[PDB]
Amino acid sequence: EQYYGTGRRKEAVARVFLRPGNGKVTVNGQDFNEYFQGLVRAVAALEPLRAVDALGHFDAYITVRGGGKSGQIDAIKLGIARALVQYNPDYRAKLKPLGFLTRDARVVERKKYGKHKARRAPQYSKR
Amino acid sequence: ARKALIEKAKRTPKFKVRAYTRCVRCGRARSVYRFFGLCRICLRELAHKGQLPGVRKASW
Amino acid sequence: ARIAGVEIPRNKRVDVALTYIYGIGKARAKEALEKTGINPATRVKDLTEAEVVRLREYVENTWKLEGELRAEVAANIKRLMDIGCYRGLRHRRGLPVRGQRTRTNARTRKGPRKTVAG
Amino acid sequence: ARRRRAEVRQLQPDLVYGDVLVTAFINKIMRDGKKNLAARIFYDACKIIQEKTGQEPLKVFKQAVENVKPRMEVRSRRVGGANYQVPMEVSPRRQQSLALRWLVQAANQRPERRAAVRIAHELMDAAEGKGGAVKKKEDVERMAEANRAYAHYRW
Amino acid sequence: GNKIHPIGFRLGITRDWESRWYAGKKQYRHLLLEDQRIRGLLEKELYSAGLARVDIERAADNVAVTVHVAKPGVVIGRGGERIRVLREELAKLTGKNVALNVQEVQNPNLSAPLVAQRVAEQIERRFAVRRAIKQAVQRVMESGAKGAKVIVSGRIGGAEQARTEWAAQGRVPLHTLRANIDYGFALARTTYGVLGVKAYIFLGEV
Amino acid sequence: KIRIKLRGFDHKTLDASAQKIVEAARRSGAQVSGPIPLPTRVRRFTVIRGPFKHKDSREHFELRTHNRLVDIINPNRKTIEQLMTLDLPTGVEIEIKT
Amino acid sequence: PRSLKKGVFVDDHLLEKVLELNAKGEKRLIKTWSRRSTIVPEMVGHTIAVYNGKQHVPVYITENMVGHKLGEFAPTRTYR
Amino acid sequence: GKGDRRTRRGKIWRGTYGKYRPRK
RNA sequence: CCGGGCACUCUAACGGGACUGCCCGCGAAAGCGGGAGGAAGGAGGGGACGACGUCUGGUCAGCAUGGCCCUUACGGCCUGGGCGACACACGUGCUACAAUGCCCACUACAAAGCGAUGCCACCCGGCAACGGGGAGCUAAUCGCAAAAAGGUGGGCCCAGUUCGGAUUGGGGUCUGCAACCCGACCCCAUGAAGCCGGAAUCGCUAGUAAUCGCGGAUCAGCCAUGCCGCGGUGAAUACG
Ligand SMILES: [K+]
Ligand SMILES: [Mg+2]
Ligand SMILES: [Mg+2]
Ligand SMILES: [Mg+2]
Ligand SMILES: [Mg+2]
Ligand SMILES: [Mg+2]
Ligand SMILES: [Mg+2]
Ligand SMILES: [Mg+2]
Ligand SMILES: [Mg+2]
Ligand SMILES: [Mg+2]
Ligand SMILES: [Mg+2]
Ligand SMILES: [Mg+2]
Ligand SMILES: [Mg+2]
Ligand SMILES: [Mg+2]
Ligand SMILES: [Mg+2]
């Protein structure tokens, strides 16, 4: 009927609702290619399906907000992975080697006093 | 923090622009925080002593 | 063609071409081409004799231009110097007039860098 | 890397050809962190490879990269107080890194108008065995093996 | 240039604020100045009694000033007129018309402010500084006090060169957040200069 | 339908007072809707450590204000019996509206 | 490229003084420390001593000087 | 660039509005 | 948006979670290598935190303070000037020298903050800075607000130019008692050096460098390109 996945990447969330259908995806009321398609990595958001080679068995309704559109793409990837895993647990053994179920914990490092951007030490000449 | 300059507190500064702010504790002129009315040094000292409610060391 | 002086721009968009007039930037070029009803996209060599006459008629007497403009600016600076004003003093010495510092770079008003001993 | 051995970063495969080498070339094309612009440049260059060559742009790309890889380079060494240009072999990772860097750098030396044309022409010329990148390979393999007399300083 | 204040370093855990009240941004500075004047007038009048802490709490125009003194008999006075005069000066300085409370400190040798004050008094009486620090640390350790440390700054004994006498024993883990170390500071105003006295007392672990 | 906005500098005191209000209103009112987090207002202060130049230390502090949104439904006349004067907390400000 | 606002500001210190001089004649040097004031037409012909921080310079005002400030004709610094 | 008063990036860098950067 | 409901997202309190626990190999052990499971492992990432002491390091100019010195002035008030002086030299930065770019139009995603003698939606006048009117907001509920790079389309077509905006002329706005010395901002005109930088030298090992914008403290205003933070896109390399 419906399988849900959350996903998260670099301060971005994307509710992924997988409902068996033709294979067409809606993202915030817009098409998958009207939000994307100007971003080459967008196809990566559909990599979980290609992992199980379904690609036509699930329509997707995704509600994305947070960060920029690239982190949104990766959050959509993780959400599709989680919903697909909730569909059939036997898919985990097929998704774990690909690491699609891994949460990407890389976050913008906090800026620090004395430096310029959290690590860029101010230039000095000493003479 | 000369004593005469503690005349800053003045109901008649003769002009709105001339009215600046000073540290009420040490009489400082610069780095005078408006929320506390203190300078930065007295801010640090009273914050260490714990005399500023809710003021805690930041770390993130 | 020859518009508003002895200057002739050629073989580019009419607005960018009018930019080569001394009293005219991009705003004045856009304003002229707008009030004259001329497509700013056409090249200069693609202009009608009537369009050139129209643009010339408008620009020639609607603002002050090359000769009178340079003479008026020189007269303004000369007046500032003659009245003994502070700005006239800054012009007299070749220093910044608009309140910039001189202990450092402000070199574009002082020309080349005349290094000395020390 | 003093304590550890600094294991190599594993890049994500390409979204089109599935090759990590294409991704590394994208990254060497990338400027100021503009990934999408670099991808536009490279894929438009690939569309230029076809309709100019019947061969798939992936094969031309890989053959050019193979033609740019140097076999021996020359590093400096301080011996007896003097500095010598010692020849020595090149690890495959450094071969790939120098190949991609030289490809991009020689492509931007071309007189072509837009970037995709520069990269496409450089890839084609390097695949058929010419261009600035192959000139760089020849110059390095000339400097090295031009100082064969220092081969015992290999270290 | 190191060793930040421990009380401020532990204001989150194992140490609470002396002033605990809420105030908007338009009123915080005024109540803060008021608390500062309160503590100023308090530490000038009750020094003979040995006050260790002055806690101030506000709800609405009412202030529960709790003064922790080792000897409440001095702050009370005869029959309780001293506290009357002090509340009078309190209501005169601040028109808030608030009350006042006194708390005895059992074993005043466990409150670092009073320890530092005792050391400073001894220094002002021209007492042997090294022996003073040793005796103070001993008196602290000999009643609970899993750790003790007393530091005295330059011009020890009236010398021309500034020194620092260390004289500590026990356990003082200053980097342990859950240490619960009481910290006190006192001054010795001498004919030859100024002496800084720091007191650390360690007790409790969690 | 009574708006309650608690604010303070200590989350423990606000939480305890909110639970006290909830338990004092459950026995005398209707099903309380519990408190709502009402995100924190953080105000930071960056200040050089030393009294002189020493510009690259800055030891910044923070002051946070937490808020609570009890918002009891059904303001029954029996609810204010156990309420409107029963409180331990001190450093907590209360806002009440209709 | 300079301007202040509508309602040009002139210090009323010497404003009354110059018109009081015009009311009876053409009295000699006037000393003024208000160099911030703006030149008005009713000052043309007089000679205002403007304080440059150290002394009073005898700034004589002409017709083409209207609009400027007294300090523009009283330099404060010495160079070479 | 960001130093031209009469550009969009110039207004953004200087943090101002005007003829070359309206407010819709 | 209303009815409607706390599943999800978020918000903020508590708690769980990773300890070389498990598997294989080595090892006397500690541990090391690899693997499984897992959101994450071998210090998971980042802070706060920086010993006995050293530099007779820095600051009596934040404050406190010993001694010395001035007390019809070395104290005090005020107006104005100065700290913004320019033959020159260096340090830290900002903006660039362009087509992986510039410009115009349309359009799409963020976090952290600030806001009542305040933020100011919106309407009108104005090319605009802005002014007049005026809604809301004690503020997860209103406002600052537009994020920018990005995407889509179009213009420019390698030229000191639709690169770059210094300098100067002129006309204005706002703060303020008052913008001459000596403010920012708007508009018209002006269009400089600069074609990637000698010897030399600096930062950074992953969401880092690079690049893009956003806020804040002080502040009437502001010379902020500073400083402290925030998020967007996101590399190269490490034989030794
Ligand atoms: K010293
Ligand atoms: Mg960043
Ligand atoms: Mg003093
Ligand atoms: Mg001021
Ligand atoms: Mg021109
Ligand atoms: Mg100057
Ligand atoms: Mg090359
Ligand atoms: Mg440090
Ligand atoms: Mg006017
Ligand atoms: Mg420009
Ligand atoms: Mg729930
Ligand atoms: Mg949940
Ligand atoms: Mg530690
Ligand atoms: Mg010295
Ligand atoms: Mg200065």
Ligand SMILES: [Mg+2]
């Ligand atoms: Mg000179």
Ligand SMILES: [Mg+2]
């Ligand atoms: Mg000379």
Ligand SMILES: [Mg+2]
């Ligand atoms: Mg220097």
Ligand SMILES: [Mg+2]
């Ligand atoms: Mg309009």
Ligand SMILES: [Mg+2]
């Ligand atoms: Mg809402």
Ligand SMILES: [Mg+2]
């Ligand atoms: Mg285009």
Ligand SMILES: [Mg+2]
């Ligand atoms: Mg130009």
Ligand SMILES: [Mg+2]
């Ligand atoms: Mg030139």
Ligand SMILES: [Mg+2]
């Ligand atoms: Mg060029």
Ligand SMILES: [Mg+2]
């Ligand atoms: Mg490192």
Ligand SMILES: [Mg+2]
């Ligand atoms: Mg400001």
Ligand SMILES: [Mg+2]
């Ligand atoms: Mg700024």
Ligand SMILES: [Zn+2]
């Ligand atoms: Zn102070």
